[PDB]
């Protein structure tokens, strides 16, 4: 290739503007580049991972530096309940004087932004107290970023390139990751918690210059190597303990108390240290499973080959799957993305109900922002997991080497799978929408007692099995004489039950008929999104409408107007369709979370209990009611500090609307219009002196779908982010 892109000769000879657009859009698709080999593929990916790590380190270093330079961390650690954390300063020449006055918050001397990422609480909990600590953390992170870049450059050199066989040594990598990357890192973290964080919460200041002179525990490694580990749990912090001071401070370093800290409303630090020690032990044990160099361990290939049921109902079982997984990077990426997307939602659901950072729980805006952020990230990752699974079937799947194993039988009964998913989604949608409309009609006619309100009894029974006593079920932990409650009677049940039965935290919130309908809406969204993605993945290789789909690739526009029409027939188009459903589903769960929490923080849960049973309640008491302060950020009488979010609300609306243009109007209309503009330019005096070098053409069919989806998603994210932050920050719950 003589021009750009240099990795695609076919794109380089394109005489239109499309050469540029596509060159940007296919930069990281190394598999489709000119003269590509497997060794080059693996080495390029290995190098790119180092750059991604360097970017991650630089971002954290920037955050730390700006908090230390322009923040109010030292004033915040003395009044966490009454000081607004500062992210960074503002220097905009476009600001007017009222904007300069309105944005001077905290204790700053100029316009600043209030941080809603929760970094202040996280850093305060882990022992950081002064601006110098953040300054020296930022330098270390910059050093790490530089070293990652250096390693990325080094392993690209001729004498340090790793071979393909090294990248395919799954057993050694699994052993090292399970034992070193997971186990040893957790042991180091609990070491930090024992040595710095826990002393820090009791008024002890431990740093690099004195950590070799201070005993983390009075007994000092005696009990550990003797065996009487209980001496590390004897004297925990009292319930009257104040965080950061020695008032009511104990000496224990590893406990099993359960529940929350009375003042900080978060998990005990000793419980966290014990948890990380236990997880480190578990991962260190698990990292000794696979055979590497010493004649002991397991072979994953033999394990997969030996797991064939003798009855023959699974065919050849898992035989041969080791080679398909090991030789396909898309299979590995899909598995990793599915697991990571599951645990991102797990983190989101566990962080709001079991806060781990000091004084996070009563910072409502930060909690809402974090939950929404992590749930939307999980939603995108889960779509990626299915997209790459679909790509695997086209590019890497070998039907002959996978004869009658568990992976071919899925393609065998794809129709049975897709039809049943369709039935489930249809049933859920029909009945949820019907119940919602019935309740709406009853509320319209002035007869709220005719509503169909189903009690979520299964989930209430599960809550009562965890010890909640608001429903009077008396099962398992809610019972007094059972074996389950008797077993943990004196270890963790007291604190856990006290936290669970405390009705002003987010631990097992009371649920009613309003939750039953929204949970089924969430289930319908999940089922429909999985239906779209699974249908796209299982039909990627071909169907009755297009038997030779695998011959055209993962992303192609169509097969033309013949055979009735073939719009959106490629597997990429299934992902493009499923992104809308993922966004809708995540919006539903975030609406539910935000409305359920904003009413609980206001002291009136009954507003949500009665108004969530019909959709007009959602429209009026959640959207309309909570947009009064946001839309008043700037008005003909002045402005306040909420003007940024008011501007971003309309910005997101505008981008969302602009995306509809690319999603509705298609290419030929625009190409025929661009022809006229080309003629007009060629016939205009004093403009004939200027000539284009790339022929102007309309956006491609697939390019326009991507552009419209990007605009749709950007508007969707920005509008809700502005609304959520402004609504939770106008009143602070």
């Amino acid at each position: 290739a003589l021009r750009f892109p240099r990795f695609s000769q076919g794109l380089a000879q394109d005489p239109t503007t499309r050469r540029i657009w596509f060159g940007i859009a296919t930069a990281h698709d190394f598999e489709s580049h000119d003269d590509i080999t497997e060794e080059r593929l693996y080495q390029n990916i290995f190098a790119s991972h180092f750059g991604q790590l360097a970017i991650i380190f630089l971002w954290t270093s920037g955050n730390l530096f700006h908090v230390a330079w322009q923040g109010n961390f030292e004033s915040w650690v003395q009044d966490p309940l009454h000081v607004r954390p500062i992210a960074h300063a503002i220097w905009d020449p476009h600001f007017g004087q009222p904007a300069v006055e309105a944005f001077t918050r905290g204790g700053a001397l100029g316009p600043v932004n209030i941080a809603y990422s929760g970094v202040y609480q996280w850093w305060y909990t882990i022992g950081l107290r002064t601006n110098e600590d953040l300054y020296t953390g930022a330098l270390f992170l910059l050093f790490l970023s530089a070293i990652s870049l250096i390693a990325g450059w080094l392993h690209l050199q001729p004498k340090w390139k790793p071979s393909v066989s090294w990248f395919k040594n799954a057993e050694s990598r699994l052993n090292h990751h399970l034992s070193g990357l997971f186990g040893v890192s957790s042991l180091a973290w609990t070491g930090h918690l024992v040595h710095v964080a826990i002393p820090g919460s009791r008024g002890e200041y431990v740093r690099w210059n004195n950590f070799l002179d201070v005993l983390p525990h009075p007994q000092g490694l005696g009990p550990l190597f003797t065996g009487q580990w209980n001496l590390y749990a004897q004297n925990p912090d009292s319930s009257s303990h104040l965080f950061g001071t020695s008032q009511g401070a104990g000496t224990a370093i590893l406990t099993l108390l359960g529940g929350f800290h009375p003042q900080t409303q978060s998990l005990w630090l000793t419980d966290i240290a014990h948890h990380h020690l236990a997880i480190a032990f578990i991962f260190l044990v698990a990292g000794h499973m696979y055979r590497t160099n010493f004649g002991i361990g397991h072979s994953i290939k033999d394990l997969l080959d030996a797991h064939i049921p003798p009855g023959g109902r699974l065919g050849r079982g898992h035989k041969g799957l080791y080679d398909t997984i090991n030789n396909s990077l898309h299979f590995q990426l899909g598995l990793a993305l599915a697991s990571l997307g599951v645990i991102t939602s797990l983190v989101a659901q566990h962080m709001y109900s079991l806060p781990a950072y000091a004084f996070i729980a009563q910072d409502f805006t930060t909690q809402a922002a974090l939950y929404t952020h992590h749930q939307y990230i999980a939603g995108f990752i889960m779509t990626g997991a299915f997209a790459h699974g679909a790509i695997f079937f086209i590019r890497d799947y070998n039907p002959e080497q996978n004869e009658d194993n568990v992976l071919a039988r899925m393609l065998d009964h794809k129709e049975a799978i897709i039809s049943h998913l369709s039935w489930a989604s249809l049933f859920l949608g029909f009945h949820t929408l019907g119940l919602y409309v019935h309740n709406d009609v009853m509320l319209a006619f002035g007869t709220p007692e005719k509503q169909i309100l189903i009690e979520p009894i299964f989930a209430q029974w599960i809550q009562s099995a965890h010890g909640k006593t608001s429903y009077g079920f008396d099962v398992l932990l809610s019972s007094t004489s059972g074996p389950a409650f008797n077993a943990g009677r004196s270890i963790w049940l007291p604190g856990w039950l006290n936290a669970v039965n405390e009705n002003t935290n987010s631990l097992f919130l009371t649920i009613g008929p309003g939750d039953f309908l929204v949970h089924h809406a969430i289930a319908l969204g999940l089922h429909t999104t999985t239906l779209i993605l699974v249908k796209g993945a299982l039909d990627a290789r071909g169907s009755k409408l297009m038997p030779d789909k695998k011959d055209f690739g993962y992303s192609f526009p169509c097969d033309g107007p013949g055979r009735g029409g073939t719009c959106d027939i490629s597997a990429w188009d299934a992902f493009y369709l499923a992104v809308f459903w993922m966004l809708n589903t995540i919006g539903w769960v975030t609406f539910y979370w935000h409305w359920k929490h904003i009413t609980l923080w206001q002291g009136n849960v009954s507003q949500f209990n009665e108004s969530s049973t019909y959709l007009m309640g959602w429209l009026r008491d959640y959207l309309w009611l909570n947009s009064s302060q946001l839309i008043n950020g700037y008005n003909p009488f002045g402005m306040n500090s909420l003007s940024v979010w008011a501007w971003m609300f309309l910005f997101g609306h505008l981008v969302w609307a602009t995306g509809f243009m690319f999603l509705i109007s298609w290419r030929g209309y625009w190409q025929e219009l661009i022809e006229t503009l080309a003629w007009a330019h060629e016939r205009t005096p004093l403009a004939n002196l200027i000539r284009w070098r790339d022929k102007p053409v309309a956006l491609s069919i697939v390019q326009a779908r991507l552009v419209g989806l990007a605009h749709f998603s950007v508007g969707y994210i920005f509008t809700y982010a502005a609304f959520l932050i402004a609504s939770t920050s106008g009143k602070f719950g």
């Binding site: 003589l2 021009r3 750009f4 060159g23 300063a89 220097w91 905009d92 020449p93 070098r693």
Partner: peptide, 29 residues
């Protein structure tokens, strides 16, 4: 001090230099 100098550099000067360089790169040959 620094923001009054750095903000114009990152917001105007650096994007202009990068755009000029990238345009000259993509118009080559």
């Amino acid at each position: 001090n620094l923001p009054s100098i750095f903000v114009p550099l990152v917001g105007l000067v650096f994007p202009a230099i990068a755009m000029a360089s990238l345009f000259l790169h993509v118009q080559k040959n």
